[PDB]
Design a protein around this ligand. Structure first.
Ligand SMILES: *[C@H](C)[C@H]1/C(=C/C2=NC(=C\c3[nH]c(C[C@H]4NC(=O)C(C=C)=C4C)c(C)c3CCC(=O)O)/C(CCC(=O)O)=C2C)NC(=O)[C@@H]1C
Ligand SMILES: *[C@H](C)[C@H]1/C(=C/C2=NC(=C\c3[nH]c(C[C@H]4NC(=O)C(C=C)=C4C)c(C)c3CCC(=O)O)/C(CCC(=O)O)=C2C)NC(=O)[C@@H]1C
Ligand SMILES: *[C@H](C)[C@H]1/C(=C/C2=NC(=C\c3[nH]c(C[C@H]4NC(=O)C(C=C)=C4C)c(C)c3CCC(=O)O)/C(CCC(=O)O)=C2C)NC(=O)[C@@H]1C
Lengths: 186, 193, 186
């Protein structure tokens, strides 16, 4: 009756089984992730080869944040240090604007969230978008960084380990969808 | 603080040995605890079966904050996530209003797995709880749960009107105090079967 | 092309080979350390027997912070709890004024854990015009000898790499002090 991570994954798995078009899998899954997390805006961001990227799916609750679907953002928005954490540690990151802190959890039992001061450039970036809470988990295809699952909220909120676990399961299942689609299409 | 925490424990034990009514043991103890911690308001909060609760003992320094003795608070003040941390991890919590952070230290932690004693880890605290404390004029809150056998029985609550830092040693003191109260409570239950 | 920790240590080692007076090694070193770390003010603080201390060397970028060279500070500026962390854990400390947090990293034999910093210390730093402080202890054999202090007038983030550089520098200074004691032995 209520949405859980298990039922969201079961539907992604069925979509893969039916060989639905990958872009449609990504679009439909993004909407369920937003419903599951309850946040104002959930996006899937896909990297280009030069490290810039594009918002390729987006689900927004009640027009509470602007639509970024289709927009491109430069490589420099994610500096080398942050990018390295994504690639090598598969870090999940929670930004809390009100406290000026970022909480990071590698995948590598190292799944206790450790909070530290976040760079003011990134705080200012989020504030300009009207975002008070950001949660990001990277998406891989095989061993390569493919994109990001991004959750934005217009108000302060707390983020639990269970929520990061749900996001991690979802990006792991999307990785399977992406790899299977590549295999099916040559 | 350590020569003092030991004396607080001894004084509780003396009351148990003299066969004081549990309510009197609890009342007399909060004043000695406040003196030890030095904070403006120390309370013992007792849970009702429905998860609401009541302030059943209180000691305040120089009327610095209003008295909450006898007041009831609804279950909703402690939502399920928070309550589960209390029940399953026996978490001790330090709220620092100025930074908007809450520090939590389990005594023993993870679900149906090995439970391990930790260091204090700080994270952003929910704005509702910050607003709740700020409405009372509280800048620092420290809470340790009281158990009777496996049941969450109550809380030892320490409020202060000014910013402060809280050390491991202070949490350790609070932990010994709630462990000693738990003994008084268990003995009383056995005597009133 | 740029300064790294390895070349900074090689020059400290060369100064040791010249049997320069310890104060002169330390004076000659602080400027390169500031250029390496990039902060507004780097100081070496030497403890007196009663726990008070003196700024015995200092390098400042473009007068961005006042000069504290030669000034003495009382023992109580560093309370027993803080002093014990220095002595027993060789703790490195990062204070972030904007968030009101202090991050501490032991040397041990884990990462940086942030907690609220005492408001007395916040006020101490603010009164100096400091928004970022990073401190690592200096030892001689097993005795706490002084501090390497890095101050900045603007908020910033501090990485593990910066702590590693500071740790290499205070370890090399410990060698300079020990060698100096042996060479000046009666
Ligand atoms: C300053 C002049 C730079 C800049 C600096 C930084 N960005 C940092 C982290 C970061 N940025 C993103 C952007 C990504 N998040 C979004 O919401 C969107 C747009 C929809 C994008 C493209 C991400 C994912 C990250 C990683 C952290 C996170 O997951 O939130 C960063 C590190 C901050 C820290 O860890 O302390 C810095 C210094 N960003 C700018 O835009 C300008 C060019
Ligand atoms: C929001 C609309 C809710 C609400 C939400 C939360 N309360 C949280 C934690 C919490 N609350 C108490 C209350 C307890 N402390 C006191 O001082 C008193 C009264 C004297 C009482 C009854 C406690 C003990 C706790 C646990 C945290 C702690 O030990 O301080 C909470 C979680 C915060 C977090 O951990 O991030 C939330 C979201 N509280 C409300 O009053 C309204 C109805
Ligand atoms: C309050 C009435 C006291 C007082 C209290 C505290 N000082 C704390 C830590 C601390 N202080 C220093 C001083 C040292 N840093 C400098 O920049 C200089 C001078 C240029 C000096 C002499 C250090 C090194 C430390 C350790 C932490 C750090 O490395 O930054 C402290 C603990 C803070 C905390 O950990 O929460 C307290 C409570 N300081 C005062 O000046 C007055 C007398």
């Amino acid at each position: 009756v209520s949405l859980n991570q298990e039922s969201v994954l079961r539907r992604i798995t069925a979509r893969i089984r039916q060989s639905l078009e990958l872009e449609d899998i990504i679009t439909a899954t993004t909407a369920e992730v937003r419903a599951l997390l309850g946040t104002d805006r959930v996006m899937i961001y896909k990297f280009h080869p030069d490290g810039s990227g594009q918002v390729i799916a987006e689900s927004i609750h009640e027009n509470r944040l602007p639509s970024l679907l289709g927009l491109n953002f430069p490589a420099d928005d994610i500096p080398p240090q942050a990018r390295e954490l994504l690639v090598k540690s598969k870090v999940r990151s929670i930004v809390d604007v009100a406290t000026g802190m970022i909480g990071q959890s590698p995948v590598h039992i190292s799944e206790d969230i450790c909070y530290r001061p976040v760079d003011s450039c990134h705080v200012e970036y989020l504030t300009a978008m009207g975002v008070k809470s950001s949660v990001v988990a990277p998406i891989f295809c095989q061993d390569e960084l493919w994109g990001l699952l991004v959750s934005h909220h217009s108000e302060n909120r707390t983020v639990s380990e269970d929520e990061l676990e749900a996001m991690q399961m979802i990006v792991d299942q999307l990785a399977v969808a992406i790899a299977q689609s590549h295999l099916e299409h040559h």
